[PDB]
Amino acid sequence: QLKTSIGLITCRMNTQNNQIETILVQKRYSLAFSEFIHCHYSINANQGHLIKMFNNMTINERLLVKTLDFDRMWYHIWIETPVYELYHKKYQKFRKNWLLPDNGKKLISLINQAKGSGTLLWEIPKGKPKEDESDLTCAIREFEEETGITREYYQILPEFKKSMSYFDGKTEYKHIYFLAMLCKSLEEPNMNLSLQYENRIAEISKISWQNMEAVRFISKRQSFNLEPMIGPAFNFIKNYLRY
Amino acid sequence: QLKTSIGLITCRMNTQNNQIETILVQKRYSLAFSEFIHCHYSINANQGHLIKMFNNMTINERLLVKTLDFDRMWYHIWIETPVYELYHKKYQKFRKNWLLPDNGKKLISLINQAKGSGTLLWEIPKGKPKEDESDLTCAIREFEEETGITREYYQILPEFKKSMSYFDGKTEYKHIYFLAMLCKSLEEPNMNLSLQYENRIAEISKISWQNMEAVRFISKRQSFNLEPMIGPAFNFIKNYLRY
Numbered sequence: 001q002l003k004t005s006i007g008l009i010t011c012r013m014n015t016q017n018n019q020i021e022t023i024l025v026q027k028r029y030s031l032a033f034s035e036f037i038h039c040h041y042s043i044n045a046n047q048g049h050l051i052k053m054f055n056n057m058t059i060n061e062r063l064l065v066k067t068l069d070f071d072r073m074w075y076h077i078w079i080e081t082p083v084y085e086l087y088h089k090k091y092q093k094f095r096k097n098w099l100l101p102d103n104g105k106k107l108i109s110l111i112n113q114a115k116g117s118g119t120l121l122w123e124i125p126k127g128k129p130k131e132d133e134s135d136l137t138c139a140i141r142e143f144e145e146e147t148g149i150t151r152e153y154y155q156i157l158p159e160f161k162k163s164m165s166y167f168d169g170k171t172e173y174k175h176i177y178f179l180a181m182l183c184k185s186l187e188e189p190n191m192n193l194s195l196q197y198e199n200r201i202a203e204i205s206k207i208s209w210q211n212m213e214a215v216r217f218i219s220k221r222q223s224f225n226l227e228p229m230i231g232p233a234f235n236f237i238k239n240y241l242r243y
Numbered sequence: 244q245l246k247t248s249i250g251l252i253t254c255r256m257n258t259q260n261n262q263i264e265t266i267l268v269q270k271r272y273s274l275a276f277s278e279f280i281h282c283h284y285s286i287n288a289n290q291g292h293l294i295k296m297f298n299n300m301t302i303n304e305r306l307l308v309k310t311l312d313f314d315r316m317w318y319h320i321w322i323e324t325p326v327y328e329l330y331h332k333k334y335q336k337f338r339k340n341w342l343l344p345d346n347g348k349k350l351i352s353l354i355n356q357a358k359g360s361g362t363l364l365w366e367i368p369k370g371k372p373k374e375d376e377s378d379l380t381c382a383i384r385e386f387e388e389e390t391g392i393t394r395e396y397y398q399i400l401p402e403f404k405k406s407m408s409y410f411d412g413k414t415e416y417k418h419i420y421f422l423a424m425l426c427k428s429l430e431e432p433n434m435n436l437s438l439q440y441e442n443r444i445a446e447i448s449k450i451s452w453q454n455m456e457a458v459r460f461i462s463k464r465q466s467f468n469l470e471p472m473i474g475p476a477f478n479f480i481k482n483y484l485r486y
Binding site for chain 1: 301302303305306310318357358360434435437439447457460
């Protein structure tokens, strides 16, 4: 299985610090919460291995699970997105796993004994290309989809392209990044996040400019290491500026 | 009116890097969400004056408000803590403000047009003293209540006391901090966060060791400046350790 995503590293020279900054987005929910809600776990894997997944949720997500109300858990991710068939299948798997055996007693025990909390990832915006869509077009479209920043605000620098490959075990993930430079003021990217734009808030809780110091700080505190991507981008930006 | 909180600055020398670190806790919900839920706002405000409160909530908090289900909003803060009297008063204010005039249409419009998102503060644990409770006793009790770290784990350094004063206009905040040094290893304080301990999760989403670099990084990214507290604390720890 191969999953290819393409993203855009959009950068600014903040005229106040004389530092280079990039647009990053923070997720709204954890991968663990999603994996649990979509039944990507083994009920027959005994406790500690489902316990880590519960450990890697946020406290609020665990408090949502403790309600045993699958509709509220689902809303947390999908926000009344019309996916009824998927919802029905996942809901029946949830109640078969956790409600019919004991009306939620083992689930509540596991939720209560779970320790710690997960972290919401900072990421570069990216998504899967549409049907026979070119890579640059896909990166631009997904960037606008997630952040609301239109092509008006930036110029692509076409000689930068960075590819990264990860393996999860059976799915190979390839991530492709273009580079863009801000050509129009945009001081507060977070203000593009509004509940009237369903696709921006769908998986995003915050949009922010981040300098290299912030990129390193975040990278050393989350599973996703952003420094091998942002590093070469900022290097390219420096070379571009010195020309 | 003066509101006094007392807290404990618990510090550790990391034996691997030789960095001094302190216990900090991250809030579970924003102050804006709490103020809305407890009706600490004026309905007769012009639009912008509620726009700022909604703007400084998280996206998830706004999505909770958008359901118009006051019980779910309430649960987000209180987690079925039995406080029916207060709940009744706040629910009645919510129902008069947002449900009875138009069945939630203006509230939904306001939730939708709000832009951006707030930030969950990192804090030193602290709380209000009980009646005829001493300052140190309050700091110790509140620290244990929030983090689950008992007195076994640390030595009070009695000769440090730090006071801070803030003004909001008629509300005076005085914060008093004692200092403690870890006297037993504790690598993963976040594992004390479990839903079986209601007082730890009530207002906390994460517990972490933070060195001075992290303290400065966080302080320059939130309204709460921790460096005027942790700086002198770490100075005291440094003086204590070199002797």
